[PDB]
Amino acid sequence: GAGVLGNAAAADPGPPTRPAHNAAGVSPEMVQVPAEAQRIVVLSGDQLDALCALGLQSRIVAAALPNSSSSQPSYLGTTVHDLPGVGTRSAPDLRAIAAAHPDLILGSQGLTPQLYPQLAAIAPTVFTAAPGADWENNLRGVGAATARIAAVDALITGFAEHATQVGTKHDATHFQASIVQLTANTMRVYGANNFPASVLSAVGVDRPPSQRFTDKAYIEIGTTAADLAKSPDFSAADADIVYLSCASEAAAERAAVILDSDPWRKLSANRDNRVFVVNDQVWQTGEGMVAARGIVDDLRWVDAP
């Protein structure tokens, strides 16, 4: 009974190559990149999102797949969905990366730090920080890596204004929103330090007191049959509105079990029909500007009847 919601930039003036910064802890920290990279290999989901927000998706030649997955993300359109794979984000395939003969490689120090020297020997390589709450800084690093700092500045400025405008029109500050993600065996309740939390903050939506922690991304509650038969407490998940995504198909197949469970039916948001199923790629795994706009779109339901 839970409603389902789901959810080319011109280069800066300069020479044909530019210096760009790697994330802190990458050696070396500076890398010379082309001003107009024609064949980009992207190894992290947030950078793929960034290239789409910059209108550069037709220059991507391959992308690392989400781990345990067998396909590219679909929330970014068919051109990205059809991209060849180069292994997964946690284990990129260097032979396939070399086979794409890229002139630019984007990756993340939070995913494959050990791989940077081998990647840099194939093509100019830029590593951003780990994806998550700092997505806007990661976007800024993609902007420098593609010589599109001005373009990224406008995307960030336009997003902040757009998010604030949506929050004002829909009275976001008067609602506490909960962020929940189901896995096959557990329920994850996200706090205030992660990708979707930072987008809810940009819109101005409040969070329930149980979801304001910042020491970790989420807390995890068991949801197996043995767990449910031990009278668990899901009250950390309650709010005025609950946004719930499923981390996998097996999680989706068990979602209705948890939503029908006695511990979940105790939640006031469930009684009030204010639990909404949302796209996990938009809310959890994309972690970029296009995903962020999808979350803002879903947040338009905070003041719905």
Residue numbers in the entry: 42 to 48, 60 to 357
The authors write:
The structure of FecB was solved to 2.0 Å in space group C2, and the asymmetric unit contains two FecB molecules (chain A, 42–356 and chain B, residues 45–357, where numbering is for the unprocessed FecB form). Notably, FecB has an extra N-terminal sequence that associates with the C-terminal lobe but has an unstructured connection between the N- and C-terminal lobes (dashed black line). The substrate binding pocket of FecB is quite different from that of FecB2 in contributing residues, shape, and electrostatic charges. The FecB binding pocket has three tyrosine, four asparagine, three glutamine and two arginine residues along with a glutamate and aspartate residue, Figs 2A and 3. The binding cleft of FecB2 contains three arginine and two glutamine residues along with one glutamate, aspartate and tyrosine residue to provide polar contacts with a bound ligand; and three tryptophan and three phenylalanine residues. The resulting FecB pocket is narrower and deeper than the FecB2 ligand-binding pocket, with one side pinched together creating an almost triangular chasm, Fig 2. In contrast, the back of the FecB pocket is negatively charged. Indeed, this charged environment trapped a polyethylene glycol molecule from the crystallographic condition. Mtb FecB has highest structural similarity to ferric-siderophore binding proteins such as Bacillus cereus YfiY (2.5 Å rmsd), Staphylococcus aureus SirA (3.1 Å rmsd) and HtsA (3.6 Å rmsd). Out of the ten variants tested (R141S, L163R, Q233S, R240S, Y242S, Y270S, E272S, D322S, Q336S, and E339S), there was only one variant, E339S, that had a considerably reduced affinity to Fe-cMB. Ultimately, the affinity of the E339S variant was so diminished that it was unmeasurable due to the solubility limits of Fe-cMB. This acidic residue, Glu339, is situated at the back of the FecB ligand binding pocket.
Mtb FecB and FecB2 are predicted periplasmic binding proteins implicated in host iron acquisition; however, their precise roles are not well understood. In vitro ligand binding experiments for FecB and FecB2 were performed with heme and bacterial siderophores from Mtb and other species, revealing that both FecB and FecB2 bind heme, while only FecB binds the Mtb sideophore ferric-carboxymycobactin (Fe-cMB). Mtb FecB and FecB2 are both members of the type III PBP family. Each protein structure is composed of N- and C-terminal lobes consisting of mixed α/β structures with a central β-sheet surrounded by α-helices, with the two lobes linked by a rigid “backbone” helix (α6), forming the characteristic fold of the type III PBP family.
